[PDB]
Structure formats: structure tokens, C-alpha cells
Amino acid sequence: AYSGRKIWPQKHTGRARHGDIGAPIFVGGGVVFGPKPRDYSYTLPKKVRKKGLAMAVADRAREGKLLLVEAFAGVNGKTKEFLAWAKEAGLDGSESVLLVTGNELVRRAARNLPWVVTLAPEGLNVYDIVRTERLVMDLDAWEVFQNRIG
Amino acid sequence: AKHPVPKKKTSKARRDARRSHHALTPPILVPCPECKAMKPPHTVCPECGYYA
Amino acid sequence: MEAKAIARYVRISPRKVRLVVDLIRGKSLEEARNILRYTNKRGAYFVAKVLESAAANAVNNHDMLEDRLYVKAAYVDEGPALKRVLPRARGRADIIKKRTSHITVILGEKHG
Amino acid sequence: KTYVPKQVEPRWVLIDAEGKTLGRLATKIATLLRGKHRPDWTPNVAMGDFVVVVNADKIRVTGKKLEQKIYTRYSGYPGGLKKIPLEKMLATHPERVLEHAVKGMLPKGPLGRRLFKRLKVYAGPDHPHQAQRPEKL
Amino acid sequence: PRAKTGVVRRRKHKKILKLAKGYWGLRSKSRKARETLFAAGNYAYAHRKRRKRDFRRLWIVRINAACRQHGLNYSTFIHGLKKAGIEVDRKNLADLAVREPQVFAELVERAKAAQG
RNA sequence: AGCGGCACGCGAGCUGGGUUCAGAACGUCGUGAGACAGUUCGGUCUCUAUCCGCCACGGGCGCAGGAGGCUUGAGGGGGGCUC
RNA sequence: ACCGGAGCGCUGUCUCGGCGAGGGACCCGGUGAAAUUGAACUGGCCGUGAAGAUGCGGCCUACCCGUGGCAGGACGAAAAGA
RNA sequence: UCGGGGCUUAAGCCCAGCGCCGAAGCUGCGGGUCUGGGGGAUGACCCCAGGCGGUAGGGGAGCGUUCCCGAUGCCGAUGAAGGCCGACCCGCGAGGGCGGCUGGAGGUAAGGGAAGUGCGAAUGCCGGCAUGAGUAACGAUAAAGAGGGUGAGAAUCCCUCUCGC
RNA sequence: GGUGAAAAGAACCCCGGGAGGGGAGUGAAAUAGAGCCUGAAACCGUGGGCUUACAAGCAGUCACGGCCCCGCAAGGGGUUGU
Numbered sequence: 021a022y023s024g025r026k027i028w029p030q031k032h033t034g035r036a037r038h039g040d041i042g043a044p045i046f047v048g049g050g051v052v053f054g055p056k057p058r059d060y061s062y063t064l065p066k067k068v069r070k071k072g073l074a075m076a077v078a079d080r081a082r083e084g085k086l087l088l089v090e091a092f093a094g095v096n097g098k099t100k101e102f103l104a105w106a107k108e109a110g111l112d113g114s115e116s117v118l119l120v121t122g123n124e125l126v127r128r129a130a131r132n133l134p135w136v137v138t139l140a141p142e143g144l145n146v147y148d149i150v151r152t153e154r155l156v157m158d159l160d161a162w163e164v165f166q167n168r169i170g
Numbered sequence: 171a172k173h174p175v176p177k178k179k180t181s182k183a184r185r186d187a188r189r190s191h192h193a194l195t196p197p198i199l200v201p202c203p204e205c206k207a208m209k210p211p212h213t214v215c216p217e218c219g220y221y222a
Numbered sequence: 223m224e225a226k227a228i229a230r231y232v233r234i235s236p237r238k239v240r241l242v243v244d245l246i247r248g249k250s251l252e253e254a255r256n257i258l259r260y261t262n263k264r265g266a267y268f269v270a271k272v273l274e275s276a277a278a279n280a281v282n283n284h285d286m287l288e289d290r291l292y293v294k295a296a297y298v299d300e301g302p303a304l305k306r307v308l309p310r311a312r313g314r315a316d317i318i319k320k321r322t323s324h325i326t327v328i329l330g331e332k333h334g
Numbered sequence: 335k336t337y338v339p340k341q342v343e344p345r346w347v348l349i350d351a352e353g354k355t356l357g358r359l360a361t362k363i364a365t366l367l368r369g370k371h372r373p374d375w376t377p378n379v380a381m382g383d384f385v386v387v388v389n390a391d392k393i394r395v396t397g398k399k400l401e402q403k404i405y406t407r408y409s410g411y412p413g414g415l416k417k418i419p420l421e422k423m424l425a426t427h428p429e430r431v432l433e434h435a436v437k438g439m440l441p442k443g444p445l446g447r448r449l450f451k452r453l454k455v456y457a458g459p460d461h462p463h464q465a466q467r468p469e470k471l
Numbered sequence: 472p473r474a475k476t477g478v479v480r481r482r483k484h485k486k487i488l489k490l491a492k493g494y495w496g497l498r499s500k501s502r503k504a505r506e507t508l509f510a511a512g513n514y515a516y517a518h519r520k521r522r523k524r525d526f527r528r529l530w531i532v533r534i535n536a537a538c539r540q541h542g543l544n545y546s547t548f549i550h551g552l553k554k555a556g557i558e559v560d561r562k563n564l565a566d567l568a569v570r571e572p573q574v575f576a577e578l579v580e581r582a583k584a585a586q587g
Numbered sequence: 588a589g590c591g592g593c594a595c596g597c598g599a600g601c602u603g604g605g606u607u608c609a610g611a612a613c614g615u616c617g618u619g620a621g622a623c624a625g626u627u628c629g630g631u632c633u634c635u636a637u638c639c640g641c642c643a644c645g646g647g648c649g650c651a652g653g654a655g656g657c658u659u660g661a662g663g664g665g666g667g668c669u670c
Numbered sequence: 671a672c673c674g675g676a677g678c679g680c681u682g683u684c685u686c687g688g689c690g691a692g693g694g695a696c697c698c699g700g701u702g703a704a705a706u707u708g709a710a711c712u713g714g715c716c717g718u719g720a721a722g723a724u725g726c727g728g729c730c731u732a733c734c735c736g737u738g739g740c741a742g743g744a745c746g747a748a749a750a751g752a
Numbered sequence: 753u754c755g756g757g758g759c760u761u762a763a764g765c766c767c768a769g770c771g772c773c774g775a776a777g778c779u780g781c782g783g784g785u786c787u788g789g790g791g792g793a794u795g796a797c798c799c800c801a802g803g804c805g806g807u808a809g810g811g812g813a814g815c816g817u818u819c820c821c822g823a824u825g826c827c828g829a830u831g832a833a834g835g836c837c838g839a840c841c842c843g844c845g846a847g848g849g850c851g852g853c854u855g856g857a858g859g860u861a862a863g864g865g866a867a868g869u870g871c872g873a874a875u876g877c878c879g880g881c882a883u884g885a886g887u888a889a890c891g892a893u894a895a896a897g898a899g900g901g902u903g904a905g906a907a908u909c910c911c912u913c914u915c916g917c
Numbered sequence: 918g919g920u921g922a923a924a925a926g927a928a929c930c931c932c933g934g935g936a937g938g939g940g941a942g943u944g945a946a947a948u949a950g951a952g953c954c955u956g957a958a959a960c961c962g963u964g965g966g967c968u969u970a971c972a973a974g975c976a977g978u979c980a981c982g983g984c985c986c987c988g989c990a991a992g993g994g995g996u997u998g999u
């Protein structure tokens with residue numbers, strides 16, 4: 021907002037020497053190299069996108085955590101059902117899990133459930149993979165995972 | 171502002187020293203013939219009076 | 223036992239009252255009273271008033287006797303300052319500082 | 335840690351001066367003025383021996399000196415460079431000549447001035463008959 | 472993201488100002504202390520090398536004044552020992568002149584004969 | 588009726604006639620604007636001394652007991668002309 | 671009310687200063703600024719150092735703190751030299 | 753005034769001799785670090801030797817502040833951040849850790865990421881407080897004095913008288 | 918810009934013209950008491966330990982000693998005489 025007038029003639033003034041208040045060295049004055057809006061994204065090579073994905077899956081699987089489920093007694097969007105299904109599935113909740121599935125009803129279940137994060141098939145991303153301790157994905161979802169890489 | 175100007179900010183120590191003789195001195199008083207009040211020498215006083 | 227009495231926000235220079243204070247520090251009550259009485263200074267009035275109150279507080283609130291107390295200690299403190307302008311030759315504007323005081327007086331029981 | 339000495343009683347000394355060269359004598363007087371001679375030396379405390387001299391006027395001096403040697407007394411006032419030849423000092427207070435000698439060989443520090451006190455000088459002889467008087471050459 | 476100067480400076484300063492505590496005037500109350508420290512720093516290091524030299528001569532005066540009492544120069548004393556082959560009396564422990572003078576005396580006697 | 592040092596001593600002591608701003612003119616050079624160890628008339632000289640220094644006057648202690656009165660003179664200073 | 675020369679009158683312009691009047695300076699009470707300010711425990715001479723020293727070297731001198739007064743120095747202040 | 757006191761068959765000058773002083777140079781004992789070399793399933797680390805003043809300047813390795821993932825986690829009223837003090841422990845260091853005091857509510861390990869990332873100086877910008885300094889100045893040299901009254905308190909407000917402009 | 922969980926914002930007594938204090942009372946907290954959370958630094962001040970009036974200076978550093986304070990001891994801290 022500041023003007024642009026020169027505050028002093030810079031001569032016989034005894035004062036320092038300045039132009040406008042806009043000067044950065046002027047409490048309230050403009051910023052120097054303050055951050056301007058800009059993109060942080062870029063285009064990582066496609067080959068690498070696939071590599072990391074498979075590698076991550078292979079890792080969690082190597083440890084012995086990639087379970088390929090299919091049976092879902094969870095008829096509707098009710099958490100109780102999933103919590104019971106997971107209980108007999110061997111999922112006591114002592115492990116974070118990336119529940120990958122195509123069914124939006126399975127979603128509703130583990131949706132609110134804290135120790136599990138729901139996810140669509142294509143949503144497979146190394147972040148959420150290495151993010152969780154366990155990995156459980158529908159066979160049909162494994163097929164679409166197989167389409168991208170398999 | 172003109173010719174006469176202090177060359178250096180006087181040290182706090184040197185400053186205090188100047189005010190050495192600066193200290194005050196207690197006044198002098200004496201008991202009067204009237205009340206026990208303390209009058210200054212060669213003087214009358216309120217709430218006491220005098221003579222002659 | 224000791225009794226305090228403070229007079230904050232007193233319009234007067236510290237250095238000025240310090241002189242008066244330094245006179246009665248560690249003096250008998252009655253002795254000090256007479257000093258302030260005939261002492262030629264403005265700071266006298268403000269120190270005498272508060273010191274007088276220090277005795278009242280010492281009595282009506284601390285069971286101390288008027289005939290046996292003195293000035294255990296006392297001192298003035300520099301409060302804020304009322305800055306004012308001042309028209310000077312050729313338009314110079316010098317700020318003037320009408321300071322304030324914080325006279326403190328604490329009495330105390332003598333001996334036994 | 336090196337020896338840490340303590341209070342020591344002042345060892346007085348009686349020193350002659352007849353025929354003694356000014357400089358040669360002052361040398362020993364100074365070295366003995368401070369406890370520099372005693373192996374228990376300590377520049378810190380300064381505990382030199384009380385030196386007392388007699389027969390000041392007797393002091394010899396080589397060649398042109400009584401006439402050549404000049405002393406300088408400068409007052410703060412202009413032209414106050416007042417200077418005096420050696421012969422005059424022997425006329426007035428002769429003890430001075432040896433004092434300004436030893437004084438010149440004493441350290442510049444404060445304690446050095448404290449040492450200059452330990453140095454007594456006259457010409458008679460006859461010192462203030464106190465007590466100690468260990469003669470020496 | 473902005474990063475206020477925060478506490479960083481105040482800690483850096485008081486940190487130093489404590490080290491300079493004990494000095495004089497503003498010299499121990501401000502950045503002036505910093506300047507003073509640099510001098511003191513280079514003083515400690517220089518006076519650290521001096522501290523050896525100080526005692527080197529400190530003993531020598533003791534030594535010389537000692538054997539001069541028996542009747543010989545410091546150079547005369549040392550020469551004898553350097554000849555007799557007795558590194559024993561490191562000039563520091565030559566202080567024997569005060570502690571057990573008899574020992575120091577016999578050390579002189581050795582030097583007397585060792586020369587000739 | 589000496590010659591010289593001392594920022595050709597001395598303007599936080601004075602003056603400002605000279606030189607060294609703006610106006611003017613003559614001579615003079617330049618087409619000109621302008622220019623001149625050429626001349627001429629005119630032209631703002633900044634109340635407060637902190638430190639050293641100096642001239643004067645006090646306060647505090649010290650002077651191995653307190654006190655009153657009178658003194659010694661190391662040292663320093665002034666003076667010093669001449670018809 | 672322009673600049674120069676001379677003369678008369680009249681005078682502290684001067685020889686050459688003296689005395690006095692009042693308004694300030696000085697002491698007490700009341701109020702209370704400024705420029706400046708690296709830090710200070712800030713002596714003289716002879717040398718010395720980027721060539722003009724409180725601060726380095728040698729020597730002399732000098733109890734601690736002020737109040738009044740003078741301006742020689744702090745290459746004093748002021749204005750990033752006209 | 754030779755740096756000074758001083759110095760005369762020398763404390764001067766020339767010739768020859770032995771001894772000592774004296775640096776952060778050298779040796780001794782200890783520790784750092786970097787480099788080359790040796791032991792070495794043994795990564796590791798031990799041992800030997802040498803380099804290591806340093807401006808512009810190039811290179812290398814760290815500490816610290818702001819924020820994100822880590823976090824629906826952990827620390828936290830039995831006290832977070834910040835503040836004040838320490839002679840203690842760790843690190844060459846920038847720093848970190850512990851103990852007391854204050855404080856009253858936030859803080860964010862290990863390992864990684866991103867920057868408005870460290871100030872003593874710019875006659876730097878803002879604010880606060882010092883120094884001169886109880887100093888100069890209280891703004892026309894027309895001028896004041898006294899009695900009474902009011903009043904917590906009057907040279908300064910009211911009233912009367914006298915004076916002056 | 919900020920009292921505190923809440924105004925419960927201090928009734929009443931005392932000194933005082935007032936201001937401001939000292940009690941009492943509220944509150945977990947009053948150096949949270951009102952431009953009041955946290956309260957650093959410059960700067961001002963009182964009390965205490967050590968220190969200084971023959972002294973020469975970038976104010977420090979190195980050594981020795983005295984005095985004061987912590988510790989069973991050796992030792993460590995503060996001050997500064999030379």
C-alpha cells in the first residue's frame with residue numbers, strides 16, 4: 021500500500037538515506053524473496069511408477085502380509101459385520117491395513133474404522149502401501165492390479 | 171547543538187562520582203522553652219508562640 | 223516484623239526525591255518526622271505523607287508500637303514517564319520527560 | 335608447584351662507600367635492595383634487604399664526570415628545564431647522587447618505589463643507630 | 472513457511488554475556504563483551520606460552536642466587552652438571568636450595584669436582 | 588627600532604578590508620553561451636565545554652593518639668631593560 | 671541611505687583604561703531540554719608508529735571528588751567536500 | 753638522554769677462547785585430526801609414519817530455527833513451550849542432556865522431506881532506555897508591597913489599600 | 918489485540934485532599950488486581966560479600982597471596998593486592 025515518494029532529499033539531512041517505505045529494510049516494508057505461489061509437482065517416469073508399486077506389494081507380500089481375500093460376510097455398510105469378519109480373518113486390529121476392494125459396501129465398513137484405511141483398486145499407491153503394516157485386497161482388485169502390472 | 175558538544179557518553183561510574191557532594195544535609199533544630207517541639211535556632215514557631 | 227507503605231504514580235522526579243529519602247533512611251520515627259518538617263524540598267511532602275502512612279499501617283495492622291519503630295529501609299523507584307512535545311527554535315521538536323516516582327517506606331520494630 | 339614463601343624478617347645491611355665507583359656500588363645495592371640475592375626470591379611479594387649506606391661524598395667517579403655529568407629537573411613551567419652539574423650536587427645534598435643512581439636501577443613498578451624506601455643513605459658515617467648493621471663490601 | 476528469529480539470538484547472546492561476566496562497564500553488559508573476549512581469548516593463549524617462560528626464569532633466579540651463595544655462577548653450575556652427566560636436577564626441582572639445602576650443597580660439590 | 592620556530596602560532600578567541608559563490612561594470616578573448624595569478628562596486632563568521640590542558644576556589648580522606656598557636660624551606664615561581 | 675579624496679566641528683575609535691546603572695551569568699526553592707556519544711580506569715616531554723599520540727617505547731611528573739572561569743588539543747560538533 | 757641508570761687497565765673498540773641465557777624453531781610425554789601403509793570369514797578397530805598459520809577462493813562435514821509425513825501414535829497438570837541460574841555430564845565446535853526456580857498448555861523421538869533458516873556494524877527500519885544534567889532555559893527590564901478571606905495546601909484564586917504601565 | 922474456568926472486579930476498617938497504599942475478603946493462583954498471561958535486554962534503585970584515596974590506562978589475561986562463601990578432604994566459586 022505504501023506510496024513511492026522519497027522520504028528525504030538525502031542531502032544535508034543528517035538522517036540516513038532512503039527512498040520509499042516499500043524498502044525491505046523498513047519494518048512493515050515489502051518482503052525480500054518471500055515465497056510466491058508455485059507448483060511442487062512434476063512428471064515422474066511411468067516405468068518407475070509401476071516399479072515402485074509392484075516392489076511395494078512384493079515387499080509386504082514377502083514379509084507375509086499380502087492376503088488375497090474374497091469371502092465377505094459383510095453384507096451391508098455396517099462396521100460390526102466387518103469387525104466380526106476381520107476378527108475371523110485374523111485381523112485383531114493390532115496392525116494397520118490397506119483394505120483394497122472394488123465393493124463400496126466393504127468401504128462403508130472399514131471406512132470409519134481407524135486402524136484400517138479404505139481404498140479403491142486403481143487407488144493403489146506406494147505411499148498407502150508402505151504406510152500400512154498389513155495389506156488385504158480383493159482377488160478381483162488383484163486382477164486389476166495385475167492389469168497394470170503382473 | 172553548536173560548538174560545545176560532549177565527546178563521549180560519560181560512564182555511569184564517572185557520572186555517579188560527580189554527584190558525590192550532591193548529597194543533602196539534615197536541617198538543624200532545637201527543643202524550645204514552650205512545648206518539647208523542635209524549633210530552628212533563632213526563631214519563633216507555630217503551635218508554640220514566643221516572648222518579648 | 224515490618225510494615226510497608228508505597229506511593230505509586232507520584233508526579234515528581236526520582237533523583238529529586240532520592241535526596242529526601244536518603245536523609246531519613248535508618249532513622250527513628252520521631253527523628254525523621256522533624257527532618258521532613260523543616261527540610262527545604264518538594265520531595266519532602268511526598269515522602270512525609272507516605273512515611274506517615276507507614277506508621278499507621280504499622281500500628282492498625284501489625285501490632286507495632288508508635289514509640290518504638292524506625293525506618294528499617296526505604297527507597298524510591300522510577301515509574302513510567304509522561305513524554306511531552308516542546309516548540310523549539312527553527313521548528314525543532316524536542317520531547318520533554320515529566321517522570322514519576324514510586325516512593326517506598328518500610329518501618330520496623332527496634333530492639334528489646 | 336614452586337616454593338611459596340611467607341613473611342620474612344627484614345635483614346638490614348651496613349654499606350661503605352669510600353672510593354667506591356658510583357655505578358659499580360649502586361649495582362650491588364639494588365640487586366640486594368630486592369631479595370634477588372637470596373635464593374628464596376619472589377618478585378611478587380618483594381622482600382629485599384634494608385640497605386643503609388654511609389660516606390656518600392667519598393664516592394669516586396672516573397675522568398670527566400664531576401664536571402661533565404649533568405642532571406635534569408623539569409618543572410611543568412616553560413624554561414623549567416633547570417639542569418645541574420655533578421659538582422653542585424656534592425656541594426648541596428650529596429646523598430642525592432647515589433639515590434638517583436639506585437632509583438634508576440630499581441624497577442619502574444609501585445613495589446620498586448616501596449624498595450627505594452628500604453634504601454637509606456647519608457655521609458658521616460653515623461647511621462640512625464637502630465640495631466642491625468651487618469657490614470659489607 | 473516463515474521462521475521467526477525466535478529465541479535463537481537471545482540464547483547466543485546471553486550465552487556469551489555470561490562468559491564475559493565479571494568485566495567492566497558495558498564491556499560486560501553487551502556485544503562489547505564479545506570484542507573483549509576475543510582479546511582475552513588471544514591473551515589466554517599467548518599467556519599460556521608465557522606461563523612456561525615465566526617459571527623457566529623464575530627458577531633460574533632461585534638457582535643462580537643459590538649457588539652464588541656457595542660461590543659460583545649459574546653458567547658455571549649448569550656446565551658442571553651438563554658435564555657430570557646429571558639430567559637429574561631439572562631446573563624446576565633445583566628448588567632444593569630451599570628444600571633440603573644440604574642436598575643442593577652436595578649437588579654443588581659434585582659440580583665443583585666434575586669440572587676439574 | 589634583530590632575524591626565525593611554533594598547521595608561515597593563534598577564527599569552538601576577535602575581525603573579514605583581501606582571496607574564494609550568487610548581482611554589476613570596464614578592459615579583453617570567444618559567432619556565441621561564456622571566460623580571466625587582469626581591474627572595479629557589493630556580498631549572512633554558528634548563546635550552552637563532556638574529556639585533556641591552563642587559571643582560580645572548595646569537599647573527602649591520609650600524615651600510627653587527640654588539639655590549639657607559631658614556623659623550617661627540599662622544590663617551584665616572579666623579577667632581570669636602559670638613557 | 672551609490673563608490674573615492676581632503677578639511678572643519680565633536681567625541682572612549684584610540685593613547686588607555688576607570689567608575690557606576692540595570693537585564694543575565696553565581697547561591698537557594700519549582701519545572702526541566704539539546705546537539706553529541708565504540709567502550710574508558712582519558713598526564714607532560716623525547717622518540718615512535720600510514721608521516722601531527724592520553725592508549726606503543728624510554729624518561730619525568732602526578733593523593734580522591736568537585737565548583738567557578740579560559741579556550742590550546744582531543745586532527746572538537748555540524749553538513750557521505752561546495 | 754646512549755631505550756634509561758649508569759660505564760673509563762670498561763658496562764667502549766679490535767683479536768682469540770671456554771660456559772650459559774634466550775622462540776610458539778627442535779627434542780621429550782599426552783591427546784586431535786586428515787593422508788598413505790600394515791593386521792583383518794572378521795564389517796570393525798588396533799599399530800606405525802607424515803601433513804595440519806592463513807584473506808580473497810574452491811572443496812568437505814555438521815549444529816540450530818519454521819513447517820509436513822511419522823500422528824486416530826508418544827510425552828504432558830505428578831506441569832508443555834518460553835523464561836531465570838548452574839562449578840555438573842556429552843560433543844573439537846555450532847550445540848545437546850541433567851538439576852533447581854518460574855510458568856500455566858501446549859509439545860512433536862528415531863529416520864526422511866521443504867524453506868520467508870542464524871545479525872554487531874548498512875549516517876540500516878521500528879520501539880524502549882541512557883549521556884550531556886539537575887546543567888541551559890522558563891519567551892520582552894511596564895513593578896511590585898502589605899492586610900484580610902477561602903482552602904488538605906496559597907508569592908501565583910477572591911477582596912481592600914499603596915505602587916508602577 | 919490477551920485478567921480469569923467464572924467478575925466472583927476487592928464490601929468494611931486504617932493513612933490520605935485525592936492518587937496510591939496497608940489489612941480483610943474472592944480465587945487453585947493477586948510479583949493473575951485491571952491496557953492486568955508469559956515478563957527476556959538495555960536503563961534506574963535498596964541491602965549484603967570482597968575492593969580502592971603514591972596512582973599511568975583497549976581495562977583484559979597469566980602467577981602468588983589475603984579476605985568472604987560452598988565441601989568429610991583434596992578441591993571449586995566470588996573479589997583484587999602485587
Ligand SMILES: [Mg+2]
Pocket residue numbers: 021022023
Ligand atoms: Mg497507502
Ligand SMILES: [Mg+2]
Pocket residue numbers: 022023024042
Ligand atoms: Mg508502489
Ligand SMILES: [Mg+2]
Pocket residue numbers: 048049050
Ligand atoms: Mg507487510
Ligand SMILES: [Mg+2]
Pocket residue numbers: 130131132133134136137138
Ligand atoms: Mg478412515
Ligand SMILES: [Mg+2]
Pocket residue numbers: 309310311
Ligand atoms: Mg525557544
Ligand SMILES: [Mg+2]
Pocket residue numbers: none
Ligand atoms: Mg614571534
Ligand SMILES: [Mg+2]
Pocket residue numbers: none
Ligand atoms: Mg594563519
Ligand SMILES: [Mg+2]
Pocket residue numbers: 598632
Ligand atoms: Mg569566526
Ligand SMILES: [Mg+2]
Pocket residue numbers: none
Ligand atoms: Mg577594497
Ligand SMILES: [Mg+2]
Pocket residue numbers: 624
Ligand atoms: Mg598576478
Ligand SMILES: [Mg+2]
Pocket residue numbers: none
Ligand atoms: Mg572588492
Ligand SMILES: [Mg+2]
Pocket residue numbers: none
Ligand atoms: Mg569582490
Ligand SMILES: [Mg+2]
Pocket residue numbers: none
Ligand atoms: Mg585530570
Ligand SMILES: [Mg+2]
Pocket residue numbers: none
Ligand atoms: Mg630552591
Ligand SMILES: [Mg+2]
Pocket residue numbers: none
Ligand atoms: Mg610539586
Ligand SMILES: [Mg+2]
Pocket residue numbers: 678
Ligand atoms: Mg565650516
